[PDB]
Symmetry: C2
Subunit: 299 residues, 2 copies
């Protein structure tokens, strides 16, 4: 059985703080003696385009309020890096987990801790889509909500800070270096993301999951090679498939080659009409290979 789940949030909850500048309130991430937050916190209230360079040049440190669970931290310095601020504070977070920073690539799964006024309210797993947006759930004040992964050694990978919701409802964030994923503008605008592709690697992972639940009515007997599929993928709204050698685990447990699943993707590209696969009426690119392996085997 396949369920989208998040990794536990306790160690990240202990890093979320409330960052306020003037009347503007959002979330920051407190690691060591640095709070990273979206630079939107220093935006003037206006309907015109925001000049962040000018806002930064006119920034006053005393207008900041940074607090963790009601207790205020003293701000020592602030620098701007891309779309984020690094706020130096006089107190290091004693609960800072063993961590790294990691930039996501499309198809990567990670966890969002949705926060408001510095307090986590929900946690959920997401996938970074090919247009570099995620399908999250955020309302006003969620800016700065962190995204993370936890490695097997317990190292927390900090990979996302929520920035904006697009007119389509899709969500845009930055990494901890300040780069906005997909280079969207980190302010109100009419920008429209390009259309998503189906993440073929994940469709392949999903079909392997159905094979392990005895769901194989859709199993094609033919195989297509990667080059053939990738040519078909470009013409039909799918990404290229990365490699065959990753899925040996499920190839050796089914025992179906990925080329058989690639052929099956071509046959199942239109509707199932009207059957289902693991309850889905169309192909699902929600789950990665790592997720499927962890959920069926714990490895």
């Amino acid at each position: 059985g396949l369920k989208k789940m998040a990794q536990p949030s306790g160690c990240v909850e202990r890093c979320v703080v409330r960052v306020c500048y003037g009347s503007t309130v959002l979330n920051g991430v407190w690691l060591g003696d640095t709070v990273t937050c979206p630079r939107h916190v220093i935006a003037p209230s206006t309907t015109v385009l925001i000049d962040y360079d000018h806002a930064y040049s006119t920034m006053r440190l005393h207008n900041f309020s940074v607090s963790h669970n009601g207790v205020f931290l003293g701000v020592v310095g602030v620098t701007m890096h891309g779309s984020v601020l690094r706020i130096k504070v006089s107190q290091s977070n004693v609960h800072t987990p063993k961590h790294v920073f990691k930039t996501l690539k499309p198809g990567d799964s990670f966890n969002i801790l949705a926060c408001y006024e510095g307090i986590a309210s929900g946690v959920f797993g997401v996938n970074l889509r090919t247009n570099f947006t995620i399908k999250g759930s955020f309302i006003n004040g969620a800016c700065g909500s962190p995204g993370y992964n936890v490695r097997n050694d317990g190292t927390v990978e900090f990979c996302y800070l929520h920035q904006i919701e697009l007119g389509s409802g899709a969500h845009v964030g930055s990494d901890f270096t300040g780069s906005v994923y997909g280079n969207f503008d980190d302010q109100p605008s009419l920008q429209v993301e390009s259309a998503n592709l189906m993440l073929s690697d994940n469709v392949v992972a999903f079909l392997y999951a159905a094979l392990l639940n005895g769901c194989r009515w859709w199993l094609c007997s033919t195989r297509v090679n990667v080059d053939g599929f990738n040519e078909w993928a470009m013409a039909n709204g799918y990404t290229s498939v990365s490699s065959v050698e990753c899925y040996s685990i499920l190839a050796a447990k089914t025992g179906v080659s990925v080329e058989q699943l690639l052929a099956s993707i071509q046959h199942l590209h239109e509707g199932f009409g009207g059957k289902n696969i693991l309850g889905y009426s169309s192909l699902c690119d929600e789950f990665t290979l790592a997720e499927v392996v962890k959920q069926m085997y714990g490895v």
Copy 2:
């Protein structure tokens, strides 16, 4: 935007323990000086039916091993209550959150912290279905994984301890008093759950979410009142609708009455052919009213 989320898990992570008796390992929840865990931990290794009363009478405290984060706790006494043990340990959990114990009813949403060897690995929201089972994702060792809700005042409601997976893959748990949801037996058996009913309260919330996102191709101008809908629901695999006024905030914002959505459910009960509602191709009962209002308005 609707995303199934879990409430943050950190306060519950600090209560999860590894409980071992002999070779059998599962999870427990340490509150104050008490660990609650499924009684399966004292089950003898055998294929024939387990006599828990006999296993309890032959129990020796020194066969227990209880640890939090690998730190072992001393077992002082044990009592059996239905399908759980209450293990008294020789020190109190300093991180015990303000809490209560609450028995769930069908239709209630709650959060699962999926744990293995006393260590949380995933967190997800679920609904208790009408057949008293949940659709989780668990592999071997998840027994004792806790279910919880966090009230607005921050009180944790402990409501579920994972017990068994039925042959169908459906998941069965107990409350913290030891009563198994749905009266299932807490040992391997051929038992089968009753048919799952569509949770009508959640479907109405879902349709309101669709309307608030501008998806209304499906909206019926017919009205069916609660009594008539509940009759129809008996004949069509749906629960009764519990009330109408609960939705008034959504009824006001959309201009659409609950009775219109009830008629819409009767219209959409077969299928959408082949349109979608918020991406779903059949009626969705995954989201409660409370979830929809919280995720769209913060209330």
